[PDB]
mmCIF file of C-alpha atoms (C1' of nucleotides) and ligand atoms in Angstrom:
data_model
loop_
_atom_site.group_PDB
_atom_site.id
_atom_site.type_symbol
_atom_site.label_atom_id
_atom_site.label_comp_id
_atom_site.label_asym_id
_atom_site.label_seq_id
_atom_site.Cartn_x
_atom_site.Cartn_y
_atom_site.Cartn_z
ATOM 1 C CA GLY O 1 -0.183 0.035 0.079
ATOM 2 C CA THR O 2 2.879 2.009 -0.147
ATOM 3 C CA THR O 3 5.728 2.579 -2.371
ATOM 4 C CA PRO O 4 9.502 2.787 -2.308
ATOM 5 C CA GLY O 5 9.244 6.270 -4.318
ATOM 6 C CA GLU O 6 6.992 7.664 -1.244
ATOM 7 C CA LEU O 7 8.908 5.863 1.903
ATOM 8 C CA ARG O 8 11.995 7.474 0.069
ATOM 9 C CA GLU O 9 10.298 10.917 1.215
ATOM 10 C CA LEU O 10 10.171 9.949 5.047
ATOM 11 C CA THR O 11 12.644 11.329 7.573
ATOM 12 C CA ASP O 12 14.499 8.438 9.022
ATOM 13 C CA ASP O 13 12.112 8.866 12.791
ATOM 14 C CA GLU O 14 9.101 8.524 10.227
ATOM 15 C CA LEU O 15 10.631 5.354 8.794
ATOM 16 C CA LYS O 16 10.651 4.052 12.056
ATOM 17 C CA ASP O 17 7.433 5.169 13.074
ATOM 18 C CA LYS O 18 5.864 3.360 9.982
ATOM 19 C CA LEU O 19 7.823 0.382 10.556
ATOM 20 C CA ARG O 20 6.345 -0.467 14.267
ATOM 21 C CA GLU O 21 3.226 0.536 12.935
ATOM 22 C CA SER O 22 3.242 -2.440 10.250
ATOM 23 C CA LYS O 23 4.448 -4.817 12.975
ATOM 24 C CA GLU O 24 0.810 -3.986 14.641
ATOM 25 C CA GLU O 25 -1.075 -4.684 12.282
ATOM 26 C CA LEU O 26 0.766 -7.977 10.941
ATOM 27 C CA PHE O 27 0.574 -8.613 14.607
ATOM 28 C CA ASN O 28 -3.488 -8.224 14.649
ATOM 29 C CA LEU O 29 -3.802 -10.209 11.380
ATOM 30 C CA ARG O 30 -1.847 -12.870 12.599
ATOM 31 C CA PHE O 31 -4.397 -13.204 15.407
ATOM 32 C CA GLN O 32 -7.488 -12.891 13.314
ATOM 33 C CA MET O 33 -6.130 -15.545 10.937
ATOM 34 C CA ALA O 34 -5.459 -17.638 13.698
ATOM 35 C CA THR O 35 -9.220 -17.029 15.064
ATOM 36 C CA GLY O 36 -10.088 -17.610 11.543
ATOM 37 C CA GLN O 37 -12.216 -13.862 10.730
ATOM 38 C CA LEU O 38 -9.749 -12.614 8.404
ATOM 39 C CA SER O 39 -11.161 -12.653 5.021
ATOM 40 C CA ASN O 40 -8.428 -10.907 2.812
ATOM 41 C CA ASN O 41 -5.273 -13.563 3.418
ATOM 42 C CA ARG O 42 -3.661 -11.241 0.912
ATOM 43 C CA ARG O 43 -3.152 -8.606 3.334
ATOM 44 C CA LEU O 44 -0.321 -10.557 5.512
ATOM 45 C CA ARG O 45 1.740 -11.019 2.070
ATOM 46 C CA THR O 46 1.845 -6.980 1.348
ATOM 47 C CA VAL O 47 1.983 -6.027 5.183
ATOM 48 C CA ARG O 48 5.231 -8.313 5.293
ATOM 49 C CA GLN O 49 6.355 -6.595 2.219
ATOM 50 C CA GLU O 50 5.630 -3.444 3.768
ATOM 51 C CA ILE O 51 7.894 -3.875 6.401
ATOM 52 C CA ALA O 52 10.536 -5.451 4.045
ATOM 53 C CA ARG O 53 10.586 -2.437 2.043
ATOM 54 C CA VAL O 54 11.141 0.165 5.131
ATOM 55 C CA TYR O 55 14.073 -2.096 6.503
ATOM 56 C CA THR O 56 15.761 -1.645 3.048
ATOM 57 C CA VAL O 57 15.261 2.054 3.079
ATOM 58 C CA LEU O 58 16.615 2.540 5.964
ATOM 59 C CA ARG O 59 19.632 0.232 5.103
ATOM 60 C CA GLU O 60 20.268 2.097 1.977
ATOM 61 C CA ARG O 61 20.234 5.596 3.963
ATOM 62 C CA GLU O 62 23.167 4.366 6.813
ATOM 63 C CA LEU O 63 25.253 2.520 3.434
ATOM 64 C CA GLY O 64 24.851 5.978 1.859
ATOM 65 C CA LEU O 65 23.647 4.739 -1.097
ATOM 66 C CA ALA O 66 21.058 7.427 -0.274
ATOM 67 C "C1'" A G 1 -30.821 -123.065 -24.976
ATOM 68 C "C1'" A G 2 -26.518 -121.613 -27.662
ATOM 69 C "C1'" G G 3 -23.960 -117.634 -30.130
ATOM 70 C "C1'" U G 4 -23.391 -112.409 -31.794
ATOM 71 C "C1'" G G 5 -24.198 -107.161 -29.990
ATOM 72 C "C1'" U G 6 -24.791 -101.069 -29.327
ATOM 73 C "C1'" U G 7 -25.656 -99.232 -24.512
ATOM 74 C "C1'" U G 8 -21.741 -95.719 -17.911
ATOM 75 C "C1'" A G 9 -17.234 -91.064 -17.518
ATOM 76 C "C1'" A G 10 -16.208 -90.029 -11.249
ATOM 77 C "C1'" G G 11 -12.189 -88.432 -13.315
ATOM 78 C "C1'" G G 12 -8.272 -87.907 -17.557
ATOM 79 C "C1'" G G 13 -6.067 -87.250 -22.880
ATOM 80 C "C1'" C G 14 -5.939 -84.484 -27.369
ATOM 81 C "C1'" G G 15 -8.367 -81.038 -30.885
ATOM 82 C "C1'" C G 16 -10.958 -76.401 -31.384
ATOM 83 C "C1'" A G 17 -13.958 -71.991 -29.556
ATOM 84 C "C1'" U G 18 -14.098 -68.124 -26.148
ATOM 85 C "C1'" G G 19 -12.236 -65.856 -21.637
ATOM 86 C "C1'" G G 20 -8.498 -64.345 -17.462
ATOM 87 C "C1'" U G 21 -3.799 -63.801 -15.462
ATOM 88 C "C1'" G G 22 0.965 -61.927 -16.840
ATOM 89 C "C1'" G G 23 3.800 -57.659 -19.304
ATOM 90 C "C1'" A G 24 7.417 -59.748 -23.712
ATOM 91 C "C1'" U G 25 6.915 -57.799 -28.635
ATOM 92 C "C1'" G G 26 6.321 -53.411 -31.931
ATOM 93 C "C1'" C G 27 6.494 -48.173 -32.126
ATOM 94 C "C1'" C G 28 7.688 -44.096 -28.700
ATOM 95 C "C1'" U G 29 10.209 -40.619 -24.434
ATOM 96 C "C1'" U G 30 10.466 -35.627 -20.060
ATOM 97 C "C1'" G G 31 16.558 -39.584 -19.204
ATOM 98 C "C1'" G G 32 21.137 -41.269 -20.214
ATOM 99 C "C1'" C G 33 25.663 -42.576 -22.718
ATOM 100 C "C1'" A G 34 30.581 -40.712 -25.820
ATOM 101 C "C1'" C G 35 32.261 -36.533 -27.981
ATOM 102 C "C1'" U G 36 33.421 -31.578 -30.820
ATOM 103 C "C1'" G G 37 33.660 -26.271 -30.750
ATOM 104 C "C1'" G G 38 34.030 -22.288 -26.968
ATOM 105 C "C1'" G G 39 33.640 -19.899 -22.051
ATOM 106 C "C1'" A G 40 35.478 -20.144 -16.662
ATOM 107 C "C1'" G G 41 39.202 -22.482 -14.350
ATOM 108 C "C1'" C G 42 39.292 -21.599 -8.202
ATOM 109 C "C1'" C G 43 35.780 -20.657 -3.773
ATOM 110 C "C1'" G G 44 36.858 -19.114 2.054
ATOM 111 C "C1'" A G 45 37.250 -15.353 8.876
ATOM 112 C "C1'" U G 46 33.410 -9.612 4.495
ATOM 113 C "C1'" G G 47 32.657 -17.099 7.572
ATOM 114 C "C1'" A G 48 33.148 -21.044 1.989
ATOM 115 C "C1'" A G 49 32.191 -26.408 0.074
ATOM 116 C "C1'" G G 50 27.407 -28.621 2.411
ATOM 117 C "C1'" G G 51 24.000 -29.048 5.846
ATOM 118 C "C1'" A G 52 19.883 -28.237 10.261
ATOM 119 C "C1'" C G 53 16.128 -25.990 11.352
ATOM 120 C "C1'" G G 54 12.381 -22.552 9.444
ATOM 121 C "C1'" U G 55 9.767 -19.732 5.636
ATOM 122 C "C1'" A G 56 3.532 -18.878 1.030
ATOM 123 C "C1'" G G 57 -3.950 -18.230 3.335
ATOM 124 C "C1'" G G 58 -4.894 -23.805 3.954
ATOM 125 C "C1'" A G 59 -0.812 -31.350 5.548
ATOM 126 C "C1'" G G 60 3.835 -33.354 3.308
ATOM 127 C "C1'" G G 61 8.173 -33.460 -0.895
ATOM 128 C "C1'" C G 62 10.605 -31.090 -4.671
ATOM 129 C "C1'" U G 63 12.592 -25.745 -5.542
ATOM 130 C "C1'" G G 64 13.510 -20.806 -4.351
ATOM 131 C "C1'" C G 65 14.670 -17.826 0.053
ATOM 132 C "C1'" G G 66 16.569 -16.275 5.409
ATOM 133 C "C1'" A G 67 12.837 -13.505 11.182
ATOM 134 C "C1'" U G 68 13.120 -8.284 5.191
ATOM 135 C "C1'" A G 69 12.305 -15.582 4.451
ATOM 136 C "C1'" A G 70 8.446 -18.922 -2.989
ATOM 137 C "C1'" G G 71 10.994 -12.921 -1.050
ATOM 138 C "C1'" C G 72 13.618 -6.381 -0.665
ATOM 139 C "C1'" C G 73 15.868 -2.249 -4.036
ATOM 140 C "C1'" U G 74 17.789 -0.068 -8.373
ATOM 141 C "C1'" C G 75 19.249 -0.293 -13.482
ATOM 142 C "C1'" G G 76 17.836 -2.627 -18.186
ATOM 143 C "C1'" G G 77 14.773 -6.384 -20.859
ATOM 144 C "C1'" G G 78 9.920 -7.571 -22.111
ATOM 145 C "C1'" G G 79 4.461 -6.643 -23.252
HETATM 146 MG MG1 MG A 101 44.558 -19.230 -8.947
HETATM 147 MG MG1 MG A 102 10.914 -3.249 -14.944
#
RNA sequence: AAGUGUUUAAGGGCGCAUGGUGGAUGCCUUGGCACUGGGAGCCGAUGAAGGACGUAGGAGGCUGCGAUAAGCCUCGGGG
């Protein structure tokens, strides 16, 4: 739901805030699926990829590639 | 009266006609084998070769991947 272009616009601290937010959303989704009340299975994959994106961007800024 | 003489198949054999079992034969192939012309001839403490355990919305194997886990970013191809 968020693209690498938009992520590169946020400050370092805003990215870390978004990473916590996504981890909380993933946690809620896992519980909803264990309870069997989650209709859209695909939200798990998308949230997980969103976490991976934020990590990638953060690492690029440390390595000086951005 | 004396004499002649067919007439059983419990089961078996042989032939033929129809089947079963079995997977030979013919015709094949996603696999092999032997080589030819090139490439590259090393990988590893910046943790290798090879593995364990994990990883997808649903059990397991093979494949891919590593808690960013059948994937993340960028540059090109493609349609
Ligand atoms: Mg050498
Ligand atoms: Mg492209």
